[PDB]
Each structure stands twice: as C-alpha cells, then as structure tokens.
Motif scaffolding. Structure first.
Motif, mmCIF file in Angstrom:
data_model
loop_
_atom_site.group_PDB
_atom_site.id
_atom_site.type_symbol
_atom_site.label_atom_id
_atom_site.label_comp_id
_atom_site.label_asym_id
_atom_site.label_seq_id
_atom_site.Cartn_x
_atom_site.Cartn_y
_atom_site.Cartn_z
ATOM 1 N N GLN A 1 2.552 -4.872 -6.227
ATOM 2 C CA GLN A 1 2.351 -5.546 -4.701
ATOM 3 C C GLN A 1 3.420 -6.585 -4.406
ATOM 4 O OE1 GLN A 1 -1.029 -5.022 -2.958
ATOM 5 N NE2 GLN A 1 -0.451 -3.524 -4.567
ATOM 6 N N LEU B 1 -1.063 -1.243 3.289
ATOM 7 C CA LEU B 1 -1.341 -1.411 1.967
ATOM 8 C C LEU B 1 -0.537 -0.612 0.858
ATOM 9 C CD1 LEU B 1 -3.684 -3.360 0.614
ATOM 10 C CD2 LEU B 1 -4.738 -1.004 -0.182
ATOM 11 N N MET B 2 0.175 -1.465 -0.241
ATOM 12 C CA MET B 2 0.685 -0.589 -1.398
ATOM 13 C C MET B 2 -0.518 -0.151 -2.173
ATOM 14 S SD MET B 2 3.561 0.727 -2.517
ATOM 15 C CE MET B 2 4.906 -0.474 -1.240
ATOM 16 N N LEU B 3 -1.225 1.002 -1.851
ATOM 17 C CA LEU B 3 -2.183 1.152 -2.803
ATOM 18 C C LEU B 3 -1.921 1.548 -4.311
ATOM 19 C CD1 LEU B 3 -5.260 1.964 -3.219
ATOM 20 C CD2 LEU B 3 -4.963 3.963 -2.004
ATOM 21 N N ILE B 4 -0.423 2.262 -4.286
ATOM 22 C CA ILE B 4 -0.104 2.632 -5.833
ATOM 23 C C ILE B 4 0.955 1.912 -5.776
ATOM 24 C CG2 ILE B 4 0.503 4.306 -7.530
ATOM 25 C CD1 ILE B 4 -1.863 6.025 -6.456
ATOM 26 N N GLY B 5 1.558 1.144 -6.657
ATOM 27 C CA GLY B 5 2.689 0.503 -6.693
ATOM 28 C C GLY B 5 2.640 -0.900 -6.862
#
Ligand SMILES: [Cl-]
Ligand SMILES: [Cl-]
Lengths: 135, 135
Positions: free
Chosen positions: A82, A76-80
């Motif tokens: 999508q 997952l790209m949790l911060i950044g």
C-alpha cells in the motif's frame, strides 16, 4: 521517499544499445512530491512543477513523434504494497529509440526536465516493445 | 522472493467499495518464478504455470467482458532499480467492478488462479480509471 527520479548513465547506454527498429512504449509511473524541490528555493507544488515539465516538453516530443497512447487515473494498488501509489500513469509511444534520444538531447527538453527533477518523488519508466494482444 | 502475489482481504474490500460506473483498467506487472511453487511439489516452470492460469481463466474473463487492451514485452527499467524486471506487462479492461468481482468468484476461475499462485514471484495489479489521453 528517496526514490528513482533519473536514469543512470550506464542504463541509458543499455537503452541506446538496444536500437531495434520499431516503436517503443514507455510506461511511466510517477509519484509527485507535495512540495517541489528546486535548487533555487522556490515554493511550488510537485503538480505545478510536473505541469511545467509537460507544458515545456510537449512540443519537443510532438515534433519527434512522441504521443501519449494510454493514460489512467490511479485508483487502487489491488496487488502490491500500500505504500506504492502513483499520481500519473501513462504510456508514451515513440517511433524509434532514436526519436527518444533526440528528445532527451534537445536543448529545450533539457531545460524542461529540470522541472521533472524538482517534481518527482519516485517514479518508474519501463521500456516495452508493443505486442499484438494475443499472448 | 517474498513478493506480492495475492490481494489482501482489506484491500479487496476497498476495491469493491469503489464501485463507480465505467470501465476499469487493470495494469498487471508480473515477475514469474523460475520454478513453480505448487503444494504438489510438481516441477513446471513459472511460465508453464502462468500459461495454464491464462488458459483456464480466459473463458471466464471473456464471458464477463474482460479483454486485454494493451500488452508489451519488457525491454528495460530505464528509470527505477535494476532488480525490478517484469516478465508479463499488460492492461486488462473490464466493463465494471462487478464484472471483475464475478470473475474472481467464479468457481472455474478460483481453480485456475491456483496456477497463478504457483507461478508468480512478485507482481503488481494497479486499478485505473481510463482517461482521454489529454492530461
Ligand atoms: Cl516517456
Ligand atoms: Cl486483470
């Protein structure tokens, strides 16, 4: 993506310019293309092409001190953003800048990398000096 | 710049949705502001504000199983755009997704993170499942 696949000559000169003694860690973020873009038209997946790159570059890397010291499966790209996602994420250590340069000058490596060029849609290759994990 | 600083609510839901057992590795790429952007207007460097974030969040992380397992000093974007550079690059391990959720819910962490919000110009936080480093 029209992304970043290869280093520029100017920036590789900077890499060689900073030749301080000590291991270098190379953080790779790789987004593979669905269909590999070889100059001959051959039809194969980016994964298959990246595998070939690995298969053929492994021995050169190994011979000159390269080793994959960490690897993870992207979840997952949790911060950044999508639209950012990576298929391969790993850290390769080499014992010197000179080792890395010798790898990328190796005739066998210079052939193997033609596969990487066909495989990669976008990527990052970040050069780091390893630290003792206490800030 | 308008970088990515915080996770969106929808993406955090996805993070919690994927609660498979096993550690999680959190790859952090952090670009700091020269001047910290607090509500106060107070003058501190991004580095100073990030320091405070770390200082006040460390105990919470430690108490719930977090540990920095790798950390590097950025030296070069060898492949990628030259406008991309990171001030802090590290991997944090947590033993579970739940451990991490409990951290970000902790009231002490919820105050500490205000410093992160002031410090960060742009960042990435990539969730990975650790692999045995053989492809
Ligand atoms: Cl590498
Ligand atoms: Cl983290």
């Amino acid at each position: 993506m029209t992304g970043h696949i290869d280093p520029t000559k100017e920036v590789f000169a900077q890499f060689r310019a900073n030749d301080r003694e000590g291991p270098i860690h190379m953080l790779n973020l790789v987004r593979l293309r669905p269909r590999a873009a070889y100059p001959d038209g051959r039809e194969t997946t980016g994964a298959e092409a990246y595998a070939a790159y690995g298969r053929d570059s492994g021995p050169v890397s190994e011979r000159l001190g390269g080793k994959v010291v960490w690897q993870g499966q992207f979840e997952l790209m949790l911060i950044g953003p999508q639209d950012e996602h990576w298929d391969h994420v790993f850290i390769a250590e080499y014992p010197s800048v000179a080792a890395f340069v010798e790898m990328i000058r190796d005739p066998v490596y210079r052939e193997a990398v033609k596969h990487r060029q066909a495989a990669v849609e976008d990527s990052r290759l970040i050069r780091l000096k390893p630290l003792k994990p206490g800030k």
